[PDB]
Design an enzyme around this catalytic site. Sequence first.
Site, mmCIF file in Angstrom:
data_model
loop_
_atom_site.group_PDB
_atom_site.id
_atom_site.type_symbol
_atom_site.label_atom_id
_atom_site.label_comp_id
_atom_site.label_asym_id
_atom_site.label_seq_id
_atom_site.Cartn_x
_atom_site.Cartn_y
_atom_site.Cartn_z
ATOM 1 N N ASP A 34 80.612 -14.549 -90.491
ATOM 2 C CA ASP A 34 82.467 -13.791 -89.716
ATOM 3 C C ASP A 34 82.697 -13.231 -88.414
ATOM 4 O O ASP A 34 82.963 -12.615 -88.048
ATOM 5 C CB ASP A 34 82.497 -12.614 -90.841
ATOM 6 N N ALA A 52 83.591 -1.442 -90.310
ATOM 7 C CA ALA A 52 83.724 -1.608 -92.212
ATOM 8 C C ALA A 52 83.639 -1.312 -93.003
ATOM 9 O O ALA A 52 82.606 -1.798 -93.405
ATOM 10 C CB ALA A 52 83.629 -3.204 -91.515
#
Length: 346
Positions: free
Chosen positions: A139, A25
Amino acid sequence: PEMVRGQVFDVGPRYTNLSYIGEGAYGMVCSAYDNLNKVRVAIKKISPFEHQTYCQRTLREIKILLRFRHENIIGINDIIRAPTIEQMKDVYIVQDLMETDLYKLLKTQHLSNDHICYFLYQILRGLKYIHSANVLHRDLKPSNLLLNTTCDLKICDFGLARVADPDHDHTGFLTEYVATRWYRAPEIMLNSKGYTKSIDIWSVGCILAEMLSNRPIFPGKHYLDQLNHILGILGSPSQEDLNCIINLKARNYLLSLPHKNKVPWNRLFPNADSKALDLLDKMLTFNPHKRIEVEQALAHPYLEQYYDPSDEPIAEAPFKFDMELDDLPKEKLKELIFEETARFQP
Ligand SMILES: Nc1nc(N)n(-c2ccccc2)n1
Protein backbone atom coordinates in the site's frame (compact mmCIF):
# COMPACT_ATOMS: atom_id res chain seq x y z
CA PRO A 1 -6.40 10.54 32.89
CA GLU A 2 -5.64 13.12 30.17
CA MET A 3 -8.58 13.89 27.89
CA VAL A 4 -8.47 14.98 24.24
CA ARG A 5 -11.27 16.25 21.98
CA GLY A 6 -13.91 14.03 23.61
CA GLN A 7 -11.77 10.94 24.27
CA VAL A 8 -9.62 9.20 26.89
CA PHE A 9 -5.93 9.44 25.94
CA ASP A 10 -4.25 7.96 29.01
CA VAL A 11 -0.59 7.86 28.21
CA GLY A 12 0.49 8.15 31.75
CA PRO A 13 3.25 10.05 33.46
CA ARG A 14 5.90 10.01 30.69
CA TYR A 15 3.91 11.86 27.98
CA THR A 16 2.19 15.22 28.51
CA ASN A 17 1.03 18.37 26.68
CA LEU A 18 -1.22 16.44 24.32
CA SER A 19 -2.36 18.11 21.12
CA TYR A 20 -4.62 16.64 18.43
CA ILE A 21 -2.81 16.05 15.11
CA GLY A 22 -5.38 14.05 13.13
CA GLU A 23 -6.82 10.66 12.27
CA GLY A 24 -4.54 8.02 10.81
CA ALA A 25 -5.80 4.73 9.37
CA TYR A 26 -6.29 3.33 12.90
CA GLY A 27 -7.74 5.94 15.26
CA MET A 28 -6.78 9.30 16.76
CA VAL A 29 -3.25 10.71 16.62
CA CYS A 30 -1.81 13.22 19.07
CA SER A 31 1.55 14.82 19.54
CA ALA A 32 2.92 14.84 23.07
CA TYR A 33 5.98 15.82 24.99
CA ASP A 34 8.16 12.90 26.05
CA ASN A 35 9.39 13.79 29.55
CA LEU A 36 12.20 11.19 29.54
CA ASN A 37 13.95 12.03 26.24
CA LYS A 38 12.58 15.61 26.21
CA VAL A 39 11.21 15.63 22.67
CA ARG A 40 7.75 15.82 21.16
CA VAL A 41 6.58 12.48 19.76
CA ALA A 42 3.48 11.17 17.99
CA ILE A 43 1.04 8.79 19.73
CA LYS A 44 -1.57 6.71 17.94
CA LYS A 45 -4.50 5.29 19.90
CA ILE A 46 -5.66 1.96 18.57
CA SER A 47 -8.87 0.28 19.80
CA PRO A 48 -8.98 -2.95 17.77
CA PHE A 49 -10.30 -5.70 20.02
CA GLU A 50 -13.94 -5.48 18.88
CA HIS A 51 -12.98 -6.49 15.31
CA GLN A 52 -10.96 -9.54 14.18
CA THR A 53 -9.87 -7.49 11.15
CA TYR A 54 -8.46 -4.55 13.12
CA CYS A 55 -6.61 -6.91 15.46
CA GLN A 56 -4.99 -8.64 12.50
CA ARG A 57 -3.79 -5.37 10.93
CA THR A 58 -2.58 -4.17 14.32
CA LEU A 59 -0.61 -7.31 15.15
CA ARG A 60 0.94 -7.57 11.72
CA GLU A 61 2.16 -3.99 11.93
CA ILE A 62 3.49 -4.34 15.46
CA LYS A 63 5.41 -7.49 14.60
CA ILE A 64 6.94 -6.02 11.46
CA LEU A 65 7.90 -2.62 12.89
CA LEU A 66 9.52 -4.19 15.95
CA ARG A 67 11.70 -6.53 13.81
CA PHE A 68 12.79 -3.92 11.26
CA ARG A 69 15.47 -1.39 12.02
CA HIS A 70 16.20 1.07 9.23
CA GLU A 71 16.57 4.86 8.85
CA ASN A 72 13.88 5.02 6.18
CA ILE A 73 11.22 2.97 8.05
CA ILE A 74 9.21 4.44 10.95
CA GLY A 75 10.11 2.73 14.22
CA ILE A 76 8.09 2.09 17.39
CA ASN A 77 9.61 3.92 20.37
CA ASP A 78 7.16 2.77 23.03
CA ILE A 79 3.85 0.95 23.38
CA ILE A 80 1.45 1.84 26.18
CA ARG A 81 -1.28 -0.45 27.47
CA ALA A 82 -2.90 -1.74 30.63
CA PRO A 83 -0.97 -4.20 32.83
CA THR A 84 -3.45 -7.05 32.37
CA ILE A 85 -5.36 -8.49 29.45
CA GLU A 86 -8.65 -7.99 31.32
CA GLN A 87 -8.02 -4.26 31.68
CA MET A 88 -6.52 -3.71 28.17
CA LYS A 89 -9.06 -1.84 25.98
CA ASP A 90 -6.68 0.25 23.88
CA VAL A 91 -3.06 0.27 22.83
CA TYR A 92 -0.98 3.41 22.31
CA ILE A 93 1.85 3.34 19.74
CA VAL A 94 4.53 5.99 20.19
CA GLN A 95 6.77 7.11 17.28
CA ASP A 96 9.06 9.98 16.32
CA LEU A 97 7.03 13.04 15.42
CA MET A 98 7.21 13.83 11.70
CA GLU A 99 6.36 17.30 10.23
CA THR A 100 4.35 16.20 7.24
CA ASP A 101 3.79 13.51 4.59
CA LEU A 102 4.33 13.45 0.85
CA TYR A 103 0.56 13.70 0.24
CA LYS A 104 0.29 17.03 2.09
CA LEU A 105 3.51 18.28 0.47
CA LEU A 106 2.31 17.57 -3.08
CA LYS A 107 -1.00 19.40 -2.44
CA THR A 108 0.81 22.59 -1.59
CA GLN A 109 4.43 22.62 -2.86
CA HIS A 110 6.33 22.32 -6.13
CA LEU A 111 9.31 19.98 -5.73
CA SER A 112 12.74 20.71 -7.17
CA ASN A 113 14.47 17.98 -9.22
CA ASP A 114 16.95 17.62 -6.31
CA HIS A 115 14.12 16.98 -3.83
CA ILE A 116 12.47 14.45 -6.23
CA CYS A 117 15.77 12.57 -6.60
CA TYR A 118 16.48 12.52 -2.84
CA PHE A 119 12.94 11.43 -1.94
CA LEU A 120 13.03 8.65 -4.56
CA TYR A 121 16.41 7.46 -3.31
CA GLN A 122 15.12 7.16 0.29
CA ILE A 123 11.92 5.31 -0.78
CA LEU A 124 13.99 2.75 -2.73
CA ARG A 125 16.60 2.45 0.04
CA GLY A 126 13.88 1.55 2.56
CA LEU A 127 12.15 -0.70 -0.02
CA LYS A 128 15.44 -2.57 -0.61
CA TYR A 129 15.49 -3.53 3.08
CA ILE A 130 11.78 -4.47 3.19
CA HIS A 131 12.07 -6.69 0.06
CA SER A 132 15.30 -8.25 1.37
CA ALA A 133 13.28 -9.55 4.35
CA ASN A 134 10.82 -11.12 1.86
CA VAL A 135 8.12 -8.64 2.87
CA LEU A 136 5.77 -6.70 0.52
CA HIS A 137 4.37 -3.40 1.71
CA ARG A 138 1.39 -3.46 -0.75
CA ASP A 139 0.00 0.00 0.00
CA LEU A 140 2.76 2.45 -0.90
CA LYS A 141 1.31 5.88 -1.60
CA PRO A 142 2.15 9.49 -0.73
CA SER A 143 0.18 9.43 2.58
CA ASN A 144 2.36 6.59 3.79
CA LEU A 145 5.62 8.48 3.27
CA LEU A 146 6.45 10.72 6.24
CA LEU A 147 8.89 13.60 6.21
CA ASN A 148 10.58 15.70 8.86
CA THR A 149 11.73 19.32 8.57
CA THR A 150 15.04 18.29 6.99
CA CYS A 151 13.36 16.08 4.32
CA ASP A 152 14.34 12.73 5.88
CA LEU A 153 11.73 10.23 4.70
CA LYS A 154 10.24 7.26 6.50
CA ILE A 155 7.90 4.62 5.22
CA CYS A 156 4.91 3.80 7.43
CA ASP A 157 1.69 1.75 7.59
CA PHE A 158 2.52 -1.96 7.36
CA GLY A 159 -1.11 -3.02 8.00
CA LEU A 160 -1.51 -4.61 4.55
CA ALA A 161 1.97 -6.12 4.33
CA ARG A 162 2.51 -9.79 3.54
CA VAL A 163 5.33 -12.25 3.10
CA ALA A 164 6.04 -12.66 -0.64
CA ASP A 165 4.44 -15.78 -2.21
CA PRO A 166 5.08 -15.86 -5.98
CA ASP A 167 3.84 -19.46 -6.29
CA HIS A 168 0.33 -18.52 -5.14
CA ASP A 169 -0.02 -15.18 -6.97
CA HIS A 170 -2.49 -16.34 -9.66
CA THR A 171 -6.20 -15.58 -9.52
CA GLY A 172 -9.12 -14.82 -11.86
CA PHE A 173 -10.24 -11.64 -13.61
CA LEU A 174 -11.78 -8.82 -11.47
CA THR A 175 -10.71 -10.29 -8.09
CA GLU A 176 -11.35 -7.99 -5.12
CA TYR A 177 -8.38 -6.11 -3.66
CA VAL A 178 -7.82 -4.00 -0.55
CA ALA A 179 -4.96 -1.54 -1.24
CA THR A 180 -5.42 2.00 -2.49
CA ARG A 181 -6.82 2.10 -6.04
CA TRP A 182 -4.67 4.72 -7.82
CA TYR A 183 -1.41 2.91 -6.94
CA ARG A 184 -2.52 -0.67 -7.86
CA ALA A 185 -0.50 -2.47 -10.48
CA PRO A 186 -2.45 -3.47 -13.62
CA GLU A 187 -2.05 -7.20 -12.94
CA ILE A 188 -4.13 -6.86 -9.75
CA MET A 189 -7.23 -6.32 -11.93
CA LEU A 190 -6.35 -9.13 -14.33
CA ASN A 191 -4.65 -12.18 -12.76
CA SER A 192 -2.73 -11.32 -9.58
CA LYS A 193 -3.30 -11.36 -5.85
CA GLY A 194 -0.37 -8.96 -5.27
CA TYR A 195 1.94 -11.51 -3.63
CA THR A 196 5.08 -10.54 -5.57
CA LYS A 197 7.62 -7.73 -5.21
CA SER A 198 6.81 -6.17 -8.55
CA ILE A 199 3.55 -4.82 -6.98
CA ASP A 200 5.54 -2.37 -4.85
CA ILE A 201 7.79 -1.11 -7.70
CA TRP A 202 4.66 -0.17 -9.69
CA SER A 203 3.45 1.94 -6.71
CA VAL A 204 6.86 3.65 -6.51
CA GLY A 205 6.59 4.47 -10.22
CA CYS A 206 3.18 6.01 -9.63
CA ILE A 207 4.68 8.09 -6.79
CA LEU A 208 7.55 9.29 -8.99
CA ALA A 209 5.08 10.39 -11.67
CA GLU A 210 3.07 12.28 -9.01
CA MET A 211 6.23 14.00 -7.72
CA LEU A 212 6.96 15.20 -11.26
CA SER A 213 3.53 16.76 -11.82
CA ASN A 214 1.82 17.18 -8.42
CA ARG A 215 -1.10 15.03 -9.45
CA PRO A 216 -1.93 11.34 -9.56
CA ILE A 217 -1.02 9.78 -12.88
CA PHE A 218 -3.75 7.04 -12.86
CA PRO A 219 -6.73 8.52 -10.93
CA GLY A 220 -9.30 5.82 -11.73
CA LYS A 221 -12.69 6.24 -10.17
CA HIS A 222 -13.53 2.55 -9.90
CA TYR A 223 -12.06 -0.88 -10.21
CA LEU A 224 -11.96 -1.20 -14.06
CA ASP A 225 -11.50 2.49 -14.88
CA GLN A 226 -8.11 2.16 -13.14
CA LEU A 227 -7.04 -0.04 -16.14
CA ASN A 228 -8.30 2.20 -18.91
CA HIS A 229 -6.29 5.01 -17.34
CA ILE A 230 -3.12 2.87 -17.39
CA LEU A 231 -3.66 1.74 -21.03
CA GLY A 232 -4.35 5.27 -22.28
CA ILE A 233 -0.81 6.13 -21.31
CA LEU A 234 1.19 2.91 -21.70
CA GLY A 235 -0.70 1.90 -24.82
CA SER A 236 -2.21 -1.49 -25.67
CA PRO A 237 -0.08 -4.39 -24.52
CA SER A 238 1.96 -6.32 -27.07
CA GLN A 239 1.14 -9.84 -28.18
CA GLU A 240 4.10 -11.02 -26.09
CA ASP A 241 2.74 -9.39 -22.94
CA LEU A 242 -0.76 -10.76 -23.68
CA ASN A 243 0.71 -14.26 -24.05
CA CYS A 244 1.69 -14.08 -20.37
CA ILE A 245 -1.92 -13.73 -19.36
CA ILE A 246 -3.33 -17.26 -19.68
CA ASN A 247 -6.65 -16.67 -17.98
CA LEU A 248 -9.21 -16.37 -20.75
CA LYS A 249 -11.53 -13.83 -19.17
CA ALA A 250 -8.67 -11.37 -18.61
CA ARG A 251 -7.02 -11.91 -21.99
CA ASN A 252 -10.29 -11.59 -23.91
CA TYR A 253 -11.24 -8.41 -22.03
CA LEU A 254 -7.96 -6.82 -23.16
CA LEU A 255 -8.46 -8.05 -26.75
CA SER A 256 -11.91 -6.36 -26.81
CA LEU A 257 -10.50 -2.86 -26.28
CA PRO A 258 -9.73 -0.41 -29.10
CA HIS A 259 -6.10 0.12 -29.93
CA LYS A 260 -4.28 2.76 -27.89
CA ASN A 261 -0.74 3.96 -28.69
CA LYS A 262 1.81 4.85 -26.01
CA VAL A 263 1.97 8.49 -24.84
CA PRO A 264 5.66 9.31 -24.52
CA TRP A 265 6.61 10.45 -21.04
CA ASN A 266 8.40 13.56 -22.31
CA ARG A 267 5.06 14.80 -23.69
CA LEU A 268 3.44 14.32 -20.27
CA PHE A 269 6.37 15.75 -18.26
CA PRO A 270 8.20 18.25 -20.53
CA ASN A 271 10.11 19.82 -17.60
CA ALA A 272 11.38 16.48 -16.21
CA ASP A 273 14.94 15.27 -16.13
CA SER A 274 15.38 12.75 -18.99
CA LYS A 275 17.08 10.25 -16.62
CA ALA A 276 14.05 10.41 -14.30
CA LEU A 277 11.85 9.60 -17.29
CA ASP A 278 13.97 6.62 -18.29
CA LEU A 279 13.65 5.15 -14.75
CA LEU A 280 9.89 5.90 -14.64
CA ASP A 281 9.45 3.94 -17.86
CA LYS A 282 11.16 0.92 -16.32
CA MET A 283 9.00 1.05 -13.14
CA LEU A 284 5.72 1.56 -15.02
CA THR A 285 6.05 -1.48 -17.27
CA PHE A 286 2.80 -3.36 -17.93
CA ASN A 287 4.32 -6.85 -17.73
CA PRO A 288 5.44 -7.43 -14.11
CA HIS A 289 8.16 -9.84 -15.23
CA LYS A 290 9.88 -7.04 -17.22
CA ARG A 291 9.49 -4.46 -14.39
CA ILE A 292 12.77 -3.25 -12.85
CA GLU A 293 13.60 -4.62 -9.38
CA VAL A 294 14.57 -2.40 -6.42
CA GLU A 295 18.32 -3.03 -6.62
CA GLN A 296 18.40 -2.16 -10.37
CA ALA A 297 16.47 0.97 -9.70
CA LEU A 298 18.99 2.15 -7.06
CA ALA A 299 21.83 1.61 -9.60
CA HIS A 300 20.06 3.66 -12.31
CA PRO A 301 21.96 6.82 -13.50
CA TYR A 302 19.21 9.08 -12.11
CA LEU A 303 20.34 8.16 -8.58
CA GLU A 304 24.12 8.13 -9.18
CA GLN A 305 24.73 10.92 -6.67
CA TYR A 306 23.31 8.82 -3.84
CA TYR A 307 23.96 5.20 -4.83
CA ASP A 308 26.18 3.37 -2.35
CA PRO A 309 25.40 -0.33 -1.86
CA SER A 310 27.57 -0.45 1.25
CA ASP A 311 25.25 2.13 2.87
CA GLU A 312 22.00 0.43 1.69
CA PRO A 313 21.54 -2.31 4.25
CA ILE A 314 19.63 -5.54 3.90
CA ALA A 315 17.77 -7.46 6.60
CA GLU A 316 19.65 -10.02 8.74
CA ALA A 317 17.08 -12.79 7.98
CA PRO A 318 13.87 -13.25 6.02
CA PHE A 319 10.73 -12.45 8.00
CA LYS A 320 8.13 -15.13 8.82
CA PHE A 321 4.84 -15.35 10.71
CA ASP A 322 5.06 -18.19 13.30
CA MET A 323 1.29 -18.57 13.44
CA GLU A 324 -0.83 -18.18 10.29
CA LEU A 325 -2.74 -15.17 11.74
CA ASP A 326 -5.45 -15.06 9.04
CA ASP A 327 -7.58 -17.81 10.67
CA LEU A 328 -7.26 -16.78 14.35
CA PRO A 329 -10.13 -15.68 16.60
CA LYS A 330 -10.35 -12.21 18.27
CA GLU A 331 -9.57 -13.75 21.66
CA LYS A 332 -6.36 -15.34 20.47
CA LEU A 333 -5.26 -12.16 18.65
CA LYS A 334 -5.79 -10.15 21.85
CA GLU A 335 -3.53 -12.51 23.73
CA LEU A 336 -0.85 -12.24 21.01
CA ILE A 337 -0.94 -8.39 21.02
CA PHE A 338 -0.66 -8.46 24.82
CA GLU A 339 2.34 -10.78 24.51
CA GLU A 340 4.10 -8.78 21.75
CA THR A 341 3.73 -5.52 23.70
CA ALA A 342 5.03 -6.97 27.03
CA ARG A 343 8.61 -5.80 26.45
CA PHE A 344 7.58 -2.17 26.94
CA GLN A 345 6.14 -2.78 30.43
CA PRO A 346 8.07 -1.87 33.61
N1 LIG B 1 5.02 9.45 13.30
C1 LIG B 1 4.14 10.35 12.90
N2 LIG B 1 4.33 11.66 12.87
C2 LIG B 1 3.17 12.08 12.39
N3 LIG B 1 2.87 13.35 12.16
N4 LIG B 1 2.36 11.04 12.17
C3 LIG B 1 1.11 11.06 11.70
C4 LIG B 1 0.71 10.06 10.80
C5 LIG B 1 -0.59 10.04 10.30
C6 LIG B 1 -1.51 11.00 10.73
C7 LIG B 1 -1.13 11.98 11.63
C8 LIG B 1 0.18 12.01 12.13
N5 LIG B 1 2.93 10.05 12.47
